Every structure is written in structure tokens, then in C-alpha cells.
Curated annotation (Swiss-Prot):
GO biological process, one term: defense response
Species whose genome carries this gene: Oldenlandia affinis
Pfam families, A to Z: Cyclotide
InterPro entries: Cyclotide, Cyclotide_moebius_CS, Cyclotide_sf
UniProt family annotation: Belongs to the cyclotide family. Moebius subfamily.
Domain remarks in the Swiss-Prot or TrEMBL record: The presence of a 'disulfide through disulfide knot' structurally defines this protein as a knottin.
Protein name as annotated: Kalata-B4
Length: 29
């Protein structure tokens, strides 16, 4: 939801993470 601690990236726009918020370069929670 903003916190850059998703642990996953989204260079393609697919954080591929649950309840994530792809913000690029890394997703957030």
C-alpha cells in the first residue's frame, strides 16, 4: 500500500505478489 517492503519487483508490471501494489521498480504493500 506504499511501503516498499513487498519483497518482490514488477519490471513488467506484475509484482506477482499477494496484496501488493506494483509501484515500480519494486512493488509495495
Amino acid at each position: 500500500n506504499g511501503l516498499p517492503v513487498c519483497g518482490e519487483t514488477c519490471v513488467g508490471g506484475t509484482c506477482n505478489t499477494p496484496g501488493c501494489t506494483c509501484s515500480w521498480p519494486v512493488c509495495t504493500r
